[PDB]
Amino acid sequence: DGPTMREITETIAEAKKKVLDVTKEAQANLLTAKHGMTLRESFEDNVVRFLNEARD
Amino acid sequence: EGLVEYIDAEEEESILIAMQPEDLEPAEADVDPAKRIRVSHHA
Amino acid sequence: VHRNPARLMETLRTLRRKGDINPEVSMIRDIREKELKIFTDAGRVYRPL
Amino acid sequence: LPHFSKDDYSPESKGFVENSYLRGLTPQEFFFHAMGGREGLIDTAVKTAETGYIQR
Amino acid sequence: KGSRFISTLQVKLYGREGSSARTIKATLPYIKQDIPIVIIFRALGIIPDGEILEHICYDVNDWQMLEMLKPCVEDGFVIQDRETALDFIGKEKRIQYAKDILQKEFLPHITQLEGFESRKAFFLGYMINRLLLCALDR
Amino acid sequence: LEPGHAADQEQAKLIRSAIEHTTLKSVTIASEIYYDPDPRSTVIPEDEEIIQLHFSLQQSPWLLRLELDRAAMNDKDLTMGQVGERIKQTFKNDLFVIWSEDNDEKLIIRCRVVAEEDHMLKKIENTMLENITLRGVENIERVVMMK
Amino acid sequence: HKLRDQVLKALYDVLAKESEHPPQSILHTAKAIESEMNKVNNCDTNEAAYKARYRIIYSNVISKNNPDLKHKIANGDITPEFLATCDAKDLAPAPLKQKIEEIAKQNLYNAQGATIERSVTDRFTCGKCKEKKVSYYQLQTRSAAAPLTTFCTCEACGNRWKFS
Amino acid sequence: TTFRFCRDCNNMLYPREDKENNRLLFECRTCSYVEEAGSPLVYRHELITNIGETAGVVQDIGSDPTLPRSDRECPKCHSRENVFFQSQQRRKDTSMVLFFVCLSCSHIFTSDQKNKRTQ
DNA sequence: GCTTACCTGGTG
RNA sequence: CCCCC
DNA sequence: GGTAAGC
Ligand SMILES: [Zn+2]
Ligand SMILES: [Zn+2]
Ligand SMILES: [Zn+2]
């Protein structure tokens, strides 16, 4: 459906925003550790998850 | 006439490539829903 | 070694683009490692752009 | 890819295919999908002997 | 196309992170044992430490790299001149065999003629630099 | 965890400290060698307070000085005394061990031996780092808490 | 009697070396032996473990930081406590006390192992617990002729399954 | 530890004690040279290495066309002309902090919000 | 603690 | 070889 | 070209 495609497009763009936000947070040394270590590992978890929640 | 060049994988590491002349070249100076979503003229 | 690698790199690229250096010869400038790599070498896979 | 800038962690740069097979893949998406595609085929090719000898 | 000269020179960093006195040694073709880098430089004409150091670490402020080179300096202390270094290969007979190896078989690309020892020396220093650059988390 | 202690996070942290293999190297920030010839008066102005203690109540002019990380030391429930004594027992009557007390800003251990002298201190610092067990069980290289 | 004279001497001096100096000469002497009398309450020179207690008292006094432990020790501040303290950390100073808290907190965070969330879908339903809190992943297990595999996990009960 | 070289022969200098006057000296093993020491520090071994610096910034590092550019204003010149990148010592254990090099005044600035970080 | 001697899917 | 789940 | 049970 047409309106469903609009919904699906704004969904992907909405998750993409969260990613950018978690990026700007990580880039400004504000992103917090995670027991599942590395600031870099930690950032990638948040990103990966956001994009998976998006596909689903 | 220096319009087109030959690039190996080593030289590729130092260049920035456009996908389409349009899609990535003129600066910005409604949209088709059926069409697939592309990136930008970023730099 | 080269003192002004930026100029040399341009003088080389335009020299090749003209035809004077075989179009297959590869030239790379790694600003970080302060190196200029030139390959005349046979067996390099290359594409036109 | 050389099509992107350096230090790019955006969905697009790190392999997020945002379109459906119905919409079509962009060249980058096409290549990244191929990168991750190959993944399985490699494993199945490698495993085959080890999986066989265990059976025996 | 100079007759399949597949000469594979290795410059090894002996000793692990935890083990004291991390020595740098190299494998020369037709030369059984691994020669400590200093002795090679000495056999290439570059005799004092500090001149040998200058071929490896281009920056004097780099105390890190220089400290790693300190056990090498000590490793090749015994050999103190070129003919002494060339002899540390395999006397008289030993000295020519060495000259030939370092000339024709060591770093065969560039040139394998004769009148370039500095060219090879500087290159060996470049390899050590790239090696120590990786030894360091750099 | 032991029955009535399975819900206590703090209990598990202490057990972790008791299990995970803790070397001297694991707590050390850096180790230095100085030519400090007077035992009664240190060349290092920082160590002034260390001297005024382990003195108020023939050796070696060569000083092995190692600084320890408070955080490291605190994670494994350790103190300067416990660490010093472990070095004191691994070398017996061969090395002279003095140390900074637990509340001084910088955590330091000062060592002196009992022809040459200098190079055998680089020897002593290698075995010191690489193989001195402070706390923990060997082979258990990392321990984590889980719920 | 080595310590009986040395604990005093060191206490007297490092308690007169202060900006306060010894105006309370009869009380700085009394404060020192009274701390030394309860000090021997540790062992009474029966164990060398008593000597280790001294180093705690002496060190926190000299130090610099903290200089104020000196001035406040002649002013008053419990002498029997400063033997059975164990409060080696809670006594002297306050910026280190705050730092020890931050250290303890962080080290307890560090000690905790990796979690890994897993993105869940209502689409699939569990077999056993019959719950729609399913976390899948696909893999090319078969030839390029047939499709992927899809390995589902129930993030609720914890159950695993497969597909064609 | 800033090690010195012998005069005459360029060879490396080694520590030695002047027991007579309780002072440190550095002597040459290739000859009879001897000089006074500066510091009492003879050797430093660092186990914990706290660093995460910028890069090999050529005063023409900007010539790299693969580098991303920001419109952030320069803290020194106020030129909204910058080129940015992550830490070059690229450890796994590295912050995702950015280092902007203004093309106009060639001054380095960081995207840090934790502290007052310039280096 | 190094060198040897065994092995490595199914049909056609 | 050239084909297979 | 990967592991182990020989000397
Ligand atoms: Zn379930
Ligand atoms: Zn000399
Ligand atoms: Zn500027």
UniProtKB/Swiss-Prot annotation, chain E:
Compartments (UniProt record): Nucleus
Subunit structure and binding partners: Component of the RNA polymerase II (Pol II) complex consisting of 12 subunits.
Extra facts: The binding of ribonucleoside triphosphate to the RNA polymerase II transcribing complex probably involves a two-step mechanism. The initial binding seems to occur at the entry (E) site and involves a magnesium ion coordinated by three conserved aspartate residues of the two largest RNA Pol II subunits. Present with 18700 molecules/cell in log phase SD medium.
Superkingdom of origin: Eukaryota
Organism in which the protein naturally occurs: Saccharomyces cerevisiae (strain ATCC 204508 / S288c)
Transmembrane segments: none
Homology family: Belongs to the RNA polymerase beta chain family.
Record function comment: DNA-dependent RNA polymerase catalyzes the transcription of DNA into RNA using the four ribonucleoside triphosphates as substrates. Second largest component of RNA polymerases II which synthesizes mRNA precursors and many functional non-coding RNAs. Proposed to contribute to the polymerase catalytic activity and forms the polymerase active center together with the largest subunit. Pol II is the central component of the basal RNA polymerase II transcription machinery.
Name recorded for this polypeptide: DNA-directed RNA polymerase II subunit RPB2
Gene: RPB2
Swiss-Prot record, chain F:
Residue ranges of coiled coil: none
Location(s), subcellular: Nucleus
PTM comment text: The tandem 7 residues repeats in the C-terminal domain (CTD) can be highly phosphorylated. The phosphorylation activates Pol II. Phosphorylation occurs mainly at residues 'Ser-2' and 'Ser-5' of the heptapeptide repeat. The phosphorylated form of Pol II appears to carry, on average, one phosphate per repeat. The phosphorylation state is believed to result from the balanced action of site-specific CTD kinases and phosphatases, and a 'CTD code' that specifies the position of Pol II within the transcription cycle has been proposed.
UniProt comment concerning the protein's domains: The C-terminal domain (CTD) serves as a platform for assembly of factors that regulate transcription initiation, elongation, termination and mRNA processing.
Binding partners and assembly: Component of the RNA polymerase II (Pol II) complex consisting of 12 subunits. Interacts with DEF1; the interaction is direct and serves to bridge RPB1 to the Elongin complex in a DNA-damaged dependent manner. Interacts with the Elongin subunit ELA1. Interacts with the Elongin subunit ELC1. Interacts with ASK10. Interacts with ESS1. Interacts with RTT103. Interacts with SHE2.
Family: Belongs to the RNA polymerase beta' chain family.
Listed name of the protein: DNA-directed RNA polymerase II subunit RPB1
Species for this entry: Saccharomyces cerevisiae (strain ATCC 204508 / S288c)
Part of the intact protein present: 1120 to 1286 of 1733
From Swiss-Prot, chain G:
Subcellular location(s) per record: Nucleus
Cellular component, GO annotation: nucleus
Domain TFIIS central: from-to ranges: 3-119
Sequence similarity: Belongs to the TFS-II family.
Role, per record: Necessary for efficient RNA polymerase II transcription elongation past template-encoded arresting sites. The arresting sites in DNA have the property of trapping a certain fraction of elongating RNA polymerases that pass through, resulting in locked ternary complexes. Cleavage of the nascent transcript by S-II allows the resumption of elongation from the new 3'-terminus. Can promote the transfer of one strand of a double-stranded DNA molecule to a homologous single strand and thus may be involved in recombination.
Additional facts recorded: S-II binds to RNA-polymerase II in the absence of transcription. Present with 6260 molecules/cell in log phase SD medium.
Protein name, per record: Transcription elongation factor S-II
Source organism: Saccharomyces cerevisiae (strain ATCC 204508 / S288c)
Lineage, uppermost ranks: Eukaryota, Fungi, Dikarya, Ascomycota, Saccharomycotina
Swiss-Prot record, chain H:
Keyword Cell wall biogenesis/degradation among UniProt keywords: no
Keywords: DNA damage, DNA repair, DNA-directed RNA polymerase, Metal-binding, Nucleus, Phosphoprotein, Transcription, Zinc, Zinc-finger
Cellular compartments annotated: Nucleus, Nucleolus
Zinc finger boundaries on the chain: TFIIS-type: 70-110
Primary location class: nucleus
Zinc finger residue ranges, C4-type: 6-31
Residues carrying Phosphoserine: S39
Binding site for Zn(2+) 1: C6, C9, C28, C31
Coiled-coil annotated residue ranges, if any: none
InterPro entries cross-referenced by the UniProt entry: DNA-dir_RNA_pol-M_15_CS, Rpa12/Rpb9/Rpc10/TFS, Zn_ribbon_RPB9, Zn_ribbon_RPB9_C, Znf_TFIIS
PROSITE patterns in alphabetical order: RNA_POL_M_15KD (PS01030), ZF_TFIIS_1 (PS00466), ZF_TFIIS_2 (PS51133)
Binding site for Zn(2+) 2: C74, C77, C102, C105
Additional comment: Present with 2440 molecules/cell in log phase SD medium.
Self-association and partners: Component of the RNA polymerase II (Pol II) complex consisting of 12 subunits.
Xref: PANTHER family: DNA-DIRECTED RNA POLYMERASE (PTHR11239), DNA-DIRECTED RNA POLYMERASE II SUBUNIT RPB9 (PTHR11239:SF1)
Protein name according to UniProt: DNA-directed RNA polymerase II subunit RPB9
Species of the source: Saccharomyces cerevisiae (strain ATCC 204508 / S288c) (Baker's yeast)
